[PDB]
Amino acid sequence: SSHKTFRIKRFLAKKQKQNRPIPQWIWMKTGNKIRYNSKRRHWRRTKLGL
Amino acid sequence: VAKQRIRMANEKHSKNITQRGNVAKTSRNAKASVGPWLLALFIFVVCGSAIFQIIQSIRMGM
Amino acid sequence: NKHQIKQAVKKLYDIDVAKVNTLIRPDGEKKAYVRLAPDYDALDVANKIGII
Amino acid sequence: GLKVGPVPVLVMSLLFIASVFMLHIWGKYTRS
Amino acid sequence: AKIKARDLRGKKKEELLKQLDDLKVELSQLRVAKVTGGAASKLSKIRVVRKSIARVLTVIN
Amino acid sequence: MDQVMQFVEPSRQFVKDSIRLVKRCTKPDRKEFQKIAMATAIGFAIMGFIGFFVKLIHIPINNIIV
Amino acid sequence: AIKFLEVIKPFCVILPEIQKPERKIQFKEKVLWTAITLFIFLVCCQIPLFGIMSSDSADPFYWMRVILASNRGTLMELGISPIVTSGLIMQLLAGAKIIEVGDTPKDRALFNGAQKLFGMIITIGQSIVYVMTGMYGDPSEMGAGICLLITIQLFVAGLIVLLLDELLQKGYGLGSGISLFIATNICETIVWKAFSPTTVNTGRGMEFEGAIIALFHLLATRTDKVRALREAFYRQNLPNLMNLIATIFVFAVVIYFQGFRVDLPIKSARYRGQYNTYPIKLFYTSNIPIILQSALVSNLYVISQMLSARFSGNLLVSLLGTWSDTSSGGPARAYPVGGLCHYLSPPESFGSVLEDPVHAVVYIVFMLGSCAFFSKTWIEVSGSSAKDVAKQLKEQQMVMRGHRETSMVHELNRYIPTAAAFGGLCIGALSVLADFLGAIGSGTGILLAVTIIYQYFEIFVKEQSEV
Ligand SMILES: [Mg+2]
């Protein structure tokens, strides 16, 4: 809702920032195995629970 | 603004059926930011340079 | 807070502040809308800071 | 325009350079 | 011209505070440069001035 | 005063803009300045030396020919 | 516009157009190409024409010879001017949109090929004039045969320059050939004068011309070291170390200001990071402005001369300009004694400046204002104004972070117009300051050489960095 607590708005903001693709220079790192961000979240497909 | 212009423009666009593939992008065909007075001034500087040098050479040629 | 923002802006850049508006952005950062006194030109001040 | 190599551009210039020298040598020699 | 802790050991509290102030002003300018198109050299200086700030504060403490 | 201010203002603004622009330029640093000078100084000498020598050889040839 | 281009199309079929380099030329090969192309140019500039008999004629364009890099009494009499004047006026027309050059490679090629056509035509016109006016003799007395050889020599000699320039620009060399040649004469001019082993039989006796060399001989001969140094510093008839000191002092000032630039942050609109910088150099218009200023200065002199020599009794003519062909000691020279042109002329020395301050003041005001005016307007002609630059960036999918595509023009408008105007005022000031301090050669020439060297160095570093 628009009516929000500071603690909830701060939790949501951190979930916003984690929800990005990995930098593409991570790919060239020497021992890298990560291909993509496997922890991407979609606001419609899966819900935060809070 | 004359509201009759909707009709005029609407009818005019409907005439585009006959020139499909070459419709004009803009009806308002009708500017150089470079002012004509200044453009002429720039011409008086650049173009003349070749011409005058010839004349000065001509002056020294007689 | 707004009082702290106002005093920091005055001391950092030696300008005068008319008022301050604040919001917290959806990414968690706080944005301050600092208005300068009518005798200061923000455009001139932004040049000193390096914004423009 | 006409397509020409770079060395021929080099060559023709050298030909022009040497030729003028020949004229200067010829001109002075005949003037003797 | 780098800041080393050995240099700062004998300095008086007032000099370190003044030395700290110069670094903090310098860092603020760099963070402006970070968003206004600074050179890669200026961006790399951010970490150097941050650890310089930590060194002075460490010696003061 | 209007006609004067009509002429004065564009002049006054231009100076303010120039000061504004210069403060925004990334002027070369001391290390940058020295680096550029060495390269330009070298290019200045290399280029002049080549012409110097080339000119010096021709002089006798030119005088001998003419 | 298309009609004008098309009428030039049939002629462009026959013109000699260099072939592009299919294989990526290595830096070592490119540098070689430049060195030979440079070396040949010098060989041509020194060689006198065949058939000349008189060369001591006075040079009203004594200044312009260094700028356009032309040596009187040599194959490079015409220099690059038939190209520079062509290059200038083509861009002027295209910038004025008189000739709309399409994005198609053919239209671009035909535009470029067209430029050459007028470029050689200027060469032909000037060369025919240079022969017809008899700046070397009397075509009746030389004889028609001699005349033709001089003309053909001049025509191809100018031709060779164009292809050599085209060769360098087409990737075989580096940078721009035109820039290379002009800077070439300037440095040789500075270096030779300092280290000239030629000596001059002045009334006092034989004297070395070299500012550096003369000091050594005077020091090695004159017991009075102070007298030797004093004499070696103020040879008003010969270059002096004082001028050498001034020339070096200019050299520093120009470097410091050549690096000035405004770095706008940009990125790719498609990919994260990839933060890049679009630089707005202080000399945005480069050396072009002062070149225009000199011509407009030259144009006024010609008009002032022609009207004075016919109607000197008219008040308007006197105000426009008055000339006296003073010929005391040296070769005859037409100097402006009265009228507007006189103030428009550059005072030679500080002493002359101090004698009549208003002459320098009016000269300063016009030279600065003209240089700024030429730069300010050249932006809308050069096709590098804010709207143009924004169009290029959008094509490249670049954008300013946090900005819409349409607000980049406004951001670019902050710096581009001001950089252009102020860019001219600074480059105009530097030429005035160099000449006032007595730099060896000319500030304009000095500015050109240093600026070109940096640009030639800029590609040097970029090419060197890749390897
Ligand atoms: Mg649901």
Swiss-Prot record, chain C:
Lineage, opening ranks: Eukaryota, Metazoa, Chordata, Craniata, Vertebrata
Coiled-coil ranges from the UniProt annotation: none
Protein species of origin: Oryctolagus cuniculus
Gene of this entry: RPL23A
Location in the cell: Cytoplasm; Nucleus
Modification note: N-terminus is methylated by METTL11A/NTM1. Citrullinated by PADI4.
Name the record gives this protein: Large ribosomal subunit protein uL23
Source organism superkingdom: Eukaryota
Record function comment: Component of the large ribosomal subunit. The ribosome is a large ribonucleoprotein complex responsible for the synthesis of proteins in the cell. Binds a specific region on the 26S rRNA. May promote p53/TP53 degradation possibly through the stimulation of MDM2-mediated TP53 polyubiquitination.
Similarity comment: family membership: Belongs to the universal ribosomal protein uL23 family.
Signal peptide: none
UniProtKB/Swiss-Prot annotation, chain E:
Biological process according to GO: maturation of LSU-rRNA from tricistronic rRNA transcript (SSU-rRNA, 5.8S rRNA, LSU-rRNA); translation
Location of Phosphoserine modifications: S28
Modified positions (N6-acetyllysine) in chain numbering: K18, K42
Glycyl lysine isopeptide (Lys-Gly) (interchain with G-Cter in SUMO2) crosslink residues: K24
Keyword Chaperone: no
Gene Ontology molecular functions: mRNA binding; structural constituent of ribosome
Subcellular locations according to the entry: Cytoplasm
A GO cellular-component term linked to this record: cytosolic large ribosomal subunit
Alphabetic keyword roster: Acetylation, Cytoplasm, Isopeptide bond, Phosphoprotein, Ribonucleoprotein, Ribosomal protein, Ubl conjugation
UniProt feature coiled coil, ranges: none
Protein's UniProt keywords contain Protein transport: no
Family to which the UniProt record says this protein belongs: Belongs to the universal ribosomal protein uL29 family.
Described purpose of this protein according to its UniProt entry: Component of the large ribosomal subunit. The ribosome is a large ribonucleoprotein complex responsible for the synthesis of proteins in the cell.
Subunit: Component of the large ribosomal subunit.
Annotated protein name in UniProt: Large ribosomal subunit protein uL29
Protein source organism: Oryctolagus cuniculus
Gene: RPL35
Whole sequence portion shown: 2 to 62 of 123
From Swiss-Prot, chain F:
Primary role: Component of SEC61 channel-forming translocon complex that mediates transport of signal peptide-containing precursor polypeptides across the endoplasmic reticulum (ER). Forms a ribosome receptor and a gated pore in the ER membrane, both functions required for cotranslational translocation of nascent polypeptides.
Phylogenetic classification of the source organism: Eukaryota, Metazoa, Chordata, Craniata, Vertebrata
Gene Ontology annotations for the cellular component aspect, listed alphabetically: endoplasmic reticulum membrane; Ssh1 translocon complex
Subcellular location: Endoplasmic reticulum membrane
Protein name as it appears in the record: Protein transport protein Sec61 subunit gamma
Organism: Canis lupus familiaris (Dog)
Stretches assigned to the Extracellular side: 62-66
Quaternary structure, from the entry: The SEC61 channel-forming translocon complex consists of channel-forming core components SEC61A1, SEC61B and SEC61G and different auxiliary components such as SEC62 and SEC63. The SEC61 channel associates with the multi-pass translocon (MPT) complex.
Modification N-acetylmethionine occurs at: M1
UniProtKB/Swiss-Prot annotation, chain G:
Alphabetical list of PROSITE patterns matching this protein: SECY_1, SECY_2
GO terms for MF: protein transmembrane transporter activity; ribosome binding; signal sequence binding
Residue ranges that the UniProt entry lists as topological domain Cytoplasmic: 1-27, 97-108, 167-176, 259-284, 379-419
Location(s) in or outside the cell: Endoplasmic reticulum membrane
Lineage: superkingdom: Eukaryota
InterPro entries from the UniProt entry: SecY/SEC61-alpha (IPR002208), SecY_CS (IPR030659), SecY_dom_sf (IPR023201), Translocon_Sec61/SecY_plug_dom (IPR019561)
GO-annotated cellular components: endoplasmic reticulum membrane; Sec61 translocon complex
Lumenal compartment residues: 46-79, 131-147, 196-240, 306-355, 437-442
Xref: Gene3D superfamilies: SecY subunit domain
One Pfam family named in its UniProt record: SecY
GO biological process, one term: cotranslational protein targeting to membrane
Keywords: Developmental protein, Endoplasmic reticulum, Membrane, Protein transport, Translocation, Transmembrane, Transmembrane helix, Transport
Its membrane topology: Multi-pass membrane protein
Transmembrane segments: 28-45, 80-96, 109-130, 148-166, 177-195, 241-258, 285-305, 356-378, 420-436, 443-457
Main localization, broad class: endoplasmic reticulum
SUPFAM superfamilies membership: Preprotein translocase SecY subunit
Quaternary data: The SEC61 channel-forming translocon complex consists of channel-forming core components SEC61A1, SEC61B and SEC61G and different auxiliary components such as SEC62 and SEC63. The SEC61 channel associates with the multi-pass translocon (MPT) complex.
Family: Belongs to the SecY/SEC61-alpha family.
Name of the molecule in the record: Protein transport protein Sec61 subunit alpha isoform 1
Organism: Canis lupus familiaris
Gene name of the encoded protein: SEC61A1
